[PDB]
Design an enzyme around this catalytic site. Sequence first.
Site, short mmCIF file in Angstrom:
data_model
loop_
_atom_site.label_atom_id
_atom_site.label_comp_id
_atom_site.label_asym_id
_atom_site.label_seq_id
_atom_site.Cartn_x
_atom_site.Cartn_y
_atom_site.Cartn_z
N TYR A 1 2.61 2.01 -10.67
CA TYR A 1 1.15 2.10 -10.67
C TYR A 1 0.48 2.02 -12.03
O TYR A 1 0.66 2.89 -12.86
CB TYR A 1 0.70 3.38 -9.97
N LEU B 1 -5.74 4.27 6.19
CA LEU B 1 -6.95 3.48 6.47
C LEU B 1 -6.75 1.99 6.24
O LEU B 1 -7.72 1.23 6.22
CB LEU B 1 -8.11 3.97 5.60
N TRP C 1 1.82 6.29 4.41
CA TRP C 1 0.80 5.80 3.48
C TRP C 1 -0.18 4.80 4.09
O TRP C 1 0.06 4.25 5.16
CB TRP C 1 1.44 5.16 2.25
N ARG D 1 -12.48 -1.91 -2.67
CA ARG D 1 -11.19 -2.39 -3.13
C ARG D 1 -11.05 -3.90 -2.96
O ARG D 1 -10.57 -4.58 -3.87
CB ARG D 1 -10.04 -1.69 -2.41
N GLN E 1 8.97 7.17 3.24
CA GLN E 1 7.55 6.90 3.05
C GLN E 1 7.23 5.57 3.68
O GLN E 1 7.42 4.51 3.08
CB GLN E 1 7.18 6.85 1.56
N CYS F 1 -5.90 0.44 3.55
CA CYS F 1 -6.57 0.11 2.29
C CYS F 1 -8.08 0.19 2.37
O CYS F 1 -8.78 -0.28 1.47
CB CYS F 1 -6.16 -1.28 1.82
N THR G 1 -2.32 7.95 -5.70
CA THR G 1 -2.91 7.47 -6.95
C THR G 1 -2.84 5.95 -7.16
O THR G 1 -3.16 5.44 -8.23
CB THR G 1 -2.21 8.14 -8.17
N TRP G 2 -2.42 5.24 -6.12
CA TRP G 2 -2.31 3.79 -6.20
C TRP G 2 -3.69 3.14 -6.28
O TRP G 2 -4.65 3.56 -5.61
CB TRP G 2 -1.54 3.27 -4.99
N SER H 1 -11.60 6.63 -3.78
CA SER H 1 -12.13 6.19 -5.07
C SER H 1 -13.32 7.01 -5.54
O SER H 1 -13.85 6.77 -6.63
CB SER H 1 -12.48 4.69 -5.03
N1 LIG Z 1 5.43 4.07 -0.43
C1 LIG Z 1 4.78 2.99 -0.93
O1 LIG Z 1 5.32 1.96 -1.31
C2 LIG Z 1 3.30 3.11 -1.00
C3 LIG Z 1 2.52 1.90 -0.93
C4 LIG Z 1 1.11 2.00 -1.00
C5 LIG Z 1 0.50 3.22 -1.13
N2 LIG Z 1 1.29 4.41 -1.20
C6 LIG Z 1 0.69 5.77 -1.36
O2 LIG Z 1 -0.24 6.02 -0.35
C7 LIG Z 1 -1.50 6.39 -0.95
C8 LIG Z 1 -2.64 6.01 -0.05
O3 LIG Z 1 -2.73 4.57 0.09
P1 LIG Z 1 -4.13 3.82 0.17
O4 LIG Z 1 -4.92 4.02 -1.06
O5 LIG Z 1 -3.85 2.42 0.60
O6 LIG Z 1 -4.86 4.50 1.37
P2 LIG Z 1 -5.94 4.21 2.51
O7 LIG Z 1 -6.33 5.49 3.14
O8 LIG Z 1 -5.42 3.09 3.33
O9 LIG Z 1 -7.12 3.59 1.66
C9 LIG Z 1 -7.85 4.42 0.71
C10 LIG Z 1 -8.92 3.51 0.11
O10 LIG Z 1 -9.84 3.11 1.20
C11 LIG Z 1 -11.21 3.41 0.81
N3 LIG Z 1 -11.68 4.62 1.55
C12 LIG Z 1 -11.03 5.81 1.77
N4 LIG Z 1 -11.73 6.69 2.48
C13 LIG Z 1 -12.89 6.06 2.72
C14 LIG Z 1 -14.05 6.48 3.43
N5 LIG Z 1 -14.16 7.68 4.00
N6 LIG Z 1 -15.06 5.58 3.49
C15 LIG Z 1 -14.99 4.36 2.92
N7 LIG Z 1 -13.93 3.86 2.23
C16 LIG Z 1 -12.89 4.76 2.15
C17 LIG Z 1 -11.17 3.52 -0.69
O11 LIG Z 1 -11.24 2.24 -1.29
P3 LIG Z 1 -12.55 1.55 -1.95
O12 LIG Z 1 -13.55 2.69 -1.96
O13 LIG Z 1 -12.14 1.14 -3.35
O14 LIG Z 1 -12.85 0.38 -1.05
C18 LIG Z 1 -9.81 4.12 -0.96
O15 LIG Z 1 -9.29 3.73 -2.24
C19 LIG Z 1 -1.45 5.74 -2.34
O16 LIG Z 1 -2.39 6.19 -3.26
C20 LIG Z 1 -0.01 5.96 -2.71
O17 LIG Z 1 0.13 7.27 -3.28
C21 LIG Z 1 2.66 4.32 -1.14
#
Ligand SMILES: NC(=O)c1ccc[n+]([C@@H]2O[C@H](COP(=O)([O-])OP(=O)(O)OC[C@H]3O[C@@H](n4cnc5c(N)ncnc54)[C@H](OP(=O)(O)O)[C@@H]3O)[C@@H](O)[C@H]2O)c1
Lengths: 326, 326, 124, 93, 93
Positions: free
Chosen positions: A55, A211, A208, A229, A179, A213, A21-22, A290
């Site tokens: 968050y 991708l 985590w 993003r 994590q 971000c 949910t970040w 998103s």
């Molecule tokens: N332990 C920690 O400190 C920590 C730190 C960070 C995150 N986390 C956790 O890990 C989770 C996942 O992190 P993350 O959001 O960075 O994940 P990610 O998989 O790296 O990025 C997901 C983001 O990439 C884009 N995206 C995803 N699938 C896509 C697709 N098929 N095509 C095109 N764009 C795509 C979207 O952004 P846009 O569409 O906005 O560009 C989406 O918000 C978080 O929500 C949180 O729960 C934990």
Amino acid sequence: LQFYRNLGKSGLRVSCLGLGTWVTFGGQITDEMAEHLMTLAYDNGINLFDTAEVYAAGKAEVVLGNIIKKKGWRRSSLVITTKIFWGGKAETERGLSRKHIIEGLKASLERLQLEYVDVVFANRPDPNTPMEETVRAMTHVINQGMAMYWGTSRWSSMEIMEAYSVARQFNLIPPICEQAEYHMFQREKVEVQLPELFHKIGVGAMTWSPLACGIVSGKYDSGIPPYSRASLKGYQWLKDKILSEEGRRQQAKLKELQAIAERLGCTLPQLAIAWCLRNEGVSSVLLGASNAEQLMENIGAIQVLPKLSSSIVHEIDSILGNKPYS
Amino acid sequence: LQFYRNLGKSGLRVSCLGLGTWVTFGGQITDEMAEHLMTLAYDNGINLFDTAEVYAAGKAEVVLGNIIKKKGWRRSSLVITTKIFWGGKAETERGLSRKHIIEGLKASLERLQLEYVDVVFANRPDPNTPMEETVRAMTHVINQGMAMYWGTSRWSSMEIMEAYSVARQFNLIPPICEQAEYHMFQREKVEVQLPELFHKIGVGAMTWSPLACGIVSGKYDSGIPPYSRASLKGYQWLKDKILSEEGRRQQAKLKELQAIAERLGCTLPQLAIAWCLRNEGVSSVLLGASNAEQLMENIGAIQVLPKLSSSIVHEIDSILGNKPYS
Amino acid sequence: YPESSGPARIIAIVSVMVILISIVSFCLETLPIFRFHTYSQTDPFFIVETLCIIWWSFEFLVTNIMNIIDIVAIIPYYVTIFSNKSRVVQIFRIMRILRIFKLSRHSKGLQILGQTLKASMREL
Amino acid sequence: GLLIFFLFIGVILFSSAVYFAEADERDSQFPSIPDAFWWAVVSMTTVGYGDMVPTTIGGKIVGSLCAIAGVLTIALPVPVIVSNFNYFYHRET
Amino acid sequence: GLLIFFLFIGVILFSSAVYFAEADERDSQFPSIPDAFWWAVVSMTTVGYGDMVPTTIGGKIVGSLCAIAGVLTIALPVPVIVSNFNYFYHRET
Ligand SMILES: NC(=O)c1ccc[n+]([C@@H]2O[C@H](COP(=O)([O-])OP(=O)(O)OC[C@H]3O[C@@H](n4cnc5c(N)ncnc54)[C@H](OP(=O)(O)O)[C@@H]3O)[C@@H](O)[C@H]2O)c1
Ligand SMILES: NC(=O)c1ccc[n+]([C@@H]2O[C@H](COP(=O)([O-])OP(=O)(O)OC[C@H]3O[C@@H](n4cnc5c(N)ncnc54)[C@H](OP(=O)(O)O)[C@@H]3O)[C@@H](O)[C@H]2O)c1
């Protein structure tokens, strides 16, 4: 092949894919969308949802909590995890002291409108607090029934082992998971450090940013798309990363990986995610999304997993040229 | 230089200056004043407030509690400490027995209108109770979530170590702090005894009466001012102390210290207080104040701290001629 | 004189919503989902508000009880507008509610109650 | 109509008072004015659920009147409607 | 009779509304319509126990009317019965 796996060696079964949910919940997307995302996921068998006090200043927890109450899902069918560390501007509102772990988890629980979380995480290590204090607090909140298990986030394997031995020393509860960030351009810790902990003390990995971000998706192969993003207010750092020289160097490699994807019959995101799940040491990957399209696509990563042959993996290592020194 | 420091080696961060409530709250000053004092302090970053069941027959706790509820400050941003020992005229209403620690803390909590305190203190040692009983009670109230940590007050370093080893013996919680008197004319325990405990078992010091009840302020350099603590009904003992031969001998030295103050560019109280904070073993100094002026002045002690050079300190030792035998 | 003929009559409806919505807004302020220069205090709950604040002061010139219903319906406003660049003025935000009484100018049933009261002071 | 209009008045009116009278509270059972509405109606109609009550003094004063005004309010348009039935009932009798 | 018949009406009617207005709730204090009955009666007669109240907005709206309608309902057949005693009391006096 196995959609459900144990978190580390605990008895808690999580889906190999979880939804985070970040940035999104309470922030970039509407609650309508949030509810749609969660329903989509839940209906598809995903039972893991990660969040944190930090968050959106707490909004994310509120939204997640709202959805769970509205959908009226059975709490026993869900696995909510939340992280604690940054809970306010006041000196005593951050860190892993007994005072904050309790006050923080209690506050998050209130926002979540839940009696408890399944796993509470120390969002990061705290050098200002003795390990014994932290393990005692985590153990406390668990005996108090505010959490079922506890884990660490961004801790070195040394600190994880310290927590573990401290736990054995005082008859407390050891953490069951870490994590860690993990994706094709960030693989040192999950591939070198963590594996030993898994086989030695059962600690598993819940990774985590699969991708990076959205970097590894390929949506930036030619500039910063709108509403991405990187284009959000408050994420200039991400924009910098993508346009940097290394950012360019990275994108150049995704182009090489696309062919791999095509051979496997999938999409780049599906590959990047399935890649993360190739090692047993990884219990689950927390996905970010998103919109509904992204989530519906990403879950397809499960079908790719069986095709990640030694050949395919080696090939990928070559393209990335960054396999960590064993 | 560092405004916030850990209480001993616990993970609890307190401001190096805290505000006490003895004599004043519920007693010598009006609640309006009390609220003004607390607001002034809170706004200035002070997060530590000490009180006790014994103060004003419990009134102090009530007033402090009232202010916190009215200002509506976030509980997580505060650090309330309270002391237990003298809770009534009945035989069973005093001491550190399990019965009184529980009943006493529960009563104080009720007066404070708080679910818990951050640190509960054994106001003084109790020879009539076995150490194991006491440590078990403190540990109990902490697991019961009525306190976050516990400390000792007026205990010899031997008793503090007894509590500590007893705690390790039964897997209980060790105390994390000692509330010792400490000012220029009372320095034996904090400078000789306590330092070893700090480096050995992490126990820190939270000192009280930095101005020796106002004696070290210099307000008595020529008689007993009106409305001064020494002039209050019930404090003849203080009056005696000041007019005694030793009282005179003391005042004669403050005169010598004034020059030191002037050189440092501060006021005598500011020096006396900064002095107390020169050793790492001291986590915080609990200030006393009967009006806003006094408090606003005393907090200036922080600016003096960086100037307390070895030279300046040695000089002060000479003037006081009472540096404890190492 | 609203219902004077129809034209100068519908000039009343433009006074209704300017109340039956001036109220609607005064309440959404207290909402938690919408809440020194901040401790006291551009912003919608200040936008569509003045969007009628001067709209009032208009007919306010275009005495009697029925009239004081518009004076006080704008008094507390310019009062706090007036100093300490850095609980007074509190007695004036809570006096903004009286604005609901501006309805009596179109609510006969309401104004009826009006006299029903003074004609009962000894009863109350 | 009159009945409802009056209520609506007493409600919006009393909900606001009870709020700015509890606003400063570490217990105020009134998140906001629109919230108090429920309390307002329940009080004026003398139901007295209890799932929402004033804790401060100002609020309890406000509430006192709210109870009294409740009676007066309802007890005005009602009598008429009472007669209308009084008639029709015996007319077709 | 009329009194009871009306109540029965207002009850079965209001119990149903408050239900389909809380149906979707992780707190709904109304297992079903027959359950709401208790609430209906208690509300209309202005007793206001509290051992059952609406938590949602729809329900609190429904409930608002239920309180108002309660008064009107009872306050119709009653006046008659009032007179009948008014008479008989002084007749045998
Ligand atoms: N332990 C920690 O400190 C920590 C730190 C960070 C995150 N986390 C956790 O890990 C989770 C996942 O992190 P993350 O959001 O960075 O994940 P990610 O998989 O790296 O990025 C997901 C983001 O990439 C884009 N995206 C995803 N699938 C896509 C697709 N098929 N095509 C095109 N764009 C795509 C979207 O952004 P846009 O569409 O906005 O560009 C989406 O918000 C978080 O929500 C949180 O729960 C934990
Ligand atoms: N652990 C224990 O058993 C224990 C025992 C005692 C106290 N304590 C704690 O320690 C706290 C501080 O003790 P304390 O009140 O004795 O402290 P202190 O710093 O020795 O004395 C403060 C008092 O001195 C006077 N004063 C302070 N600043 C002054 C200034 N700038 N100029 C002139 N006069 C000034 C005031 O008294 P007047 O203005 O009235 O003369 C004020 O009440 C207590 O409130 C309590 O929380 C703990």
